[PDB]
Structure formats: structure tokens, C-alpha cells
């Protein structure tokens, strides 16, 4: 089995990505590190780090190649689901929603909280690239999947991402009000780290 | 950012 | 295999315990059902509904030989950390923590989050027995697994057992902070069948 | 009760 690996190679980049140790993650590309990349975990690596430094991103043939090879398959599991979910800033968003809605409409425990993770993701692209019929489908779609769960920290974020949902939709006031108990949950459970990214989020929404 | 690393 | 259907059956257990649904979970042990439990399942789910109603303990027999198996088992799975974080109140406590201190001697994703709420589940025991040098070290312990993870229930619910046991020995006002500081949490995330056990818990403890 | 079910 070669899926022992890839998930301590994630779990790997997601304590990298909390401690914001930028330049041991920039590490696993090249030849410095113990672990090889095939191309796709390599352009997933670029992608990952598209979000921490600007400066960085995949070329339009890697990128290209991933769109394709995630086309023409049938059967999605541990590997195209988080090789789907940690490229959504990469791919263009016409092609991520159609693999979201294509994965939501099949049907373990950690299989269902990828898809959830997954969801989210694509939600929050969706608020950012202003798709609102595609927003209240995905909205009420996670709503079924943390149904009885004991996920609070996809929850959590869920909460934050309605809050956005409604901010940006209608502008009401009743969108902040979830934004700001979704940072006081990330408060209270002593965090320090993901509050100062909802805040700076926060922040550069409300003050313009 | 504000998205989660899917997986982990 | 046969831990596939185990983890089945608890997580069924853990669903109908939280929609507060009695007779659905008192009815694995009648002889007509779909789960045929081996007699240390049958005793792990009397200890479970022994929380739930006082007047369904197990027989003196089947603790003593359950204790008697765990005493004599080396290798801890899946298994037995699971019959012991949920007989915890049935197991006199003496024998109940030798075991939870063996459990942290022997240092995977899903083993250690299995391995926390029975760290947890033995905290709440011992502040409940009056135990506190037995308590220091399980708080030591509990607040370096979940060192940089992901597990907010499982944070919560310590956030809770540490205000606790600070209300316990010192009774000071900074235990009641957390004790309503989780109760916060568990309000924002939308636990309604969640709240009320520790709402009823919380009131209960400052009102005598 | 407040302890919670290992396993779930």
C-alpha cells in the first residue's frame, strides 16, 4: 500500500503550515528532505505554498495535467479527494465545482470528513468568486454532512464561511455576528495561531 | 489564508 | 475482519447516546437484534446505559472477569483501550487508573485521539474520586497529546475537566471561567443534546 | 453524564 506515506506526508505539511514554519515545507522539493514527490504531490506542495507566499506557483502544463488526469477517473478516494482539496486556489473554478458537485453525489468515519473538508473549501472559493446558486447547494449539502458528527473544527470553519455567505450576499449584519463567534470559538480553545488568520481575513473584509 | 489543508 | 463491525457498534452506541435514545440501545442485549455481542460487549454497553439509568449495572462476575482479562493482556489495540475508556465507572477506580498510567507508558492519527479520551475519561474519574496527585499527572499528560492538534471535542471536554478539578481542590473562581467558557463552546457549535449534560452537571456542582 | 464514549 503506498497511502502510509502521503497521509504522514499531509499531516507533515498541515504541523508545518500551524507552527507557520514556511522554509522546512519549501524544503520538500528539492533534494534535501526524506521524501519523494511524485508530480502531482509536488504541484500539490506548490499549491499549498501558493497560499503562504504569492511568489510561488505551479506551471500551466503541471497544472494542466493534474486538471486532466482528475477528469478521467472513476473511482475517488483518499488520494484525488486531497489532491482536489489542496488545489483549489490553482485550478480554475469552473472545473473544481464540477468535481465537488461530481464527489457529493455519491452516498466510512475519515472518508466523510474529507468530503467535508473538501466542501468547504469549494464553498469558501465559491463566496470568493461570487457563484450564488452554487453556494446554497453546497451550503445545504455540508449542512447533511455535519449532521450528529462531532466535528467542531470543520464546524467551526463552516460557521466562519456562513458568516462570509451572508456577508457578502446580502451585507446584513448577521454575517459578522458569525464571523466573530467563530473567532471567539478559536479563542477560547486557545488557538493563537488560525485566530490570526480569521482575524486578518476579518479584518481586510470589514474595513473596506 | 483561511482554507484547510484537506487530510490533515 | 473482526475490529471492523466493533467500531460499527460504538459508533451506532455514540449516535443513539446522543439523540438520548434509551430502548434503542437497550436492545442489544435482548436476544433479537443485528449485533451479537461477545460477553465483554455485552458488559461495556451495561456500563454505558449504567450512566444513563442507575438500575442496570453489571453483575459482579462479569467486572471481575473483564478486569481479569485486562490485567493480563500486553499488546493494547483498539480493543481494549475502548472496554476501558467505557467502563470506567463500573471498574473500581484503584484498577482503573494502574491501567490508564500503563496506557501512557507505551507512547498513528487515530490511535492517539483514542488514547486521549480515555486519558480524559480517567481525569473526570479521579477529580470524582478525590484523587490529586493523580490528577497533576493526568492533566501533564492529556495537555501534551493534544499539543498542536486538531481535536476540539476532546479539547473541550478538557477545557471542562480542568475547570473542574479547579473548582474541586481549590475552589476558586477560575475553574467556574472554564466550566462556562466550554459551556460557550459547546452553545456556538450548535450542541443542544450536548450542552444540557453539562449544563445539568455545572448546576448541580455550584448549587451545593 | 459528562464523560465521553471512547471509541465515537
Given at each position: 500500500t503506498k497511502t502510509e506515506s502521503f497521509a504522514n506526508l499531509v499531516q507533515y505539511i498541515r504541523k508545518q503550515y500551524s507552527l507557520q514554519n514556511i522554509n522546512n515545507i519549501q524544503?520538500?522539493?528539492?533534494?534535501?528532505?526524506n521524501y519523494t514527490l511524485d508530480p502531482f504531490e509536488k504541484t500539490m506542495v506548490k499549491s499549498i505554498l501558493h497560499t503562504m507566499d504569492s511568489s510561488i506557483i505551479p506551471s500551466d502544463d503541471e497544472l494542466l495535467q493534474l486538471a486532466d488526469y482528475l477528469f478521467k477517473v472513476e473511482k475517488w478516494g483518499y488520494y484525488e479527494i486531497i489532491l482536489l482539496g489542496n488545489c483549489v486556489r490553482t485550478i480554475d473554478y469552473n472545473s473544481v465545482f464540477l468535481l465537488t458537485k461530481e464527489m457529493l453525489n455519491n452516498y466510512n468515519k475519515t472518508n466523510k470528513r474529507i468530503v467535508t473538508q473538501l466542501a468547504i473549501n469549494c464553498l469558501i472559493l465559491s463566496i470568493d468568486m461570487e457563484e450564488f446558486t452554487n453556494c446554497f447547494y453546497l451550503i445545504d449539502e455540508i449542512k447533511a454532512l455535519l449532521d450528529?458528527?462531532?466535528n467542531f473544527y470543520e464546524q467551526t470553519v463552516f460557521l466562519y464561511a456562513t458568516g462570509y455567505f451572508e456577508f457578502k450576499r446580502w451585507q446584513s449584519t448577521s454575517g459578522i455576528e458569525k464571523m466573530k463567534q467563530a473567532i471567539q470559538v478559536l479563542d477560547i480553545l486557545g488557538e493563537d495561531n488560525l485566530k490570526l488568520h480569521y482575524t486578518i481575513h476579518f479584518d481586510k473584509l470589514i474595513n473596506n | 489564508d483561511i482554507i484547510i489543508i484537506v487530510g490533515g
Open positions: 524544503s520538500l522539493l528539492s533534494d534535501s528532505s450528529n458528527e462531532l | -
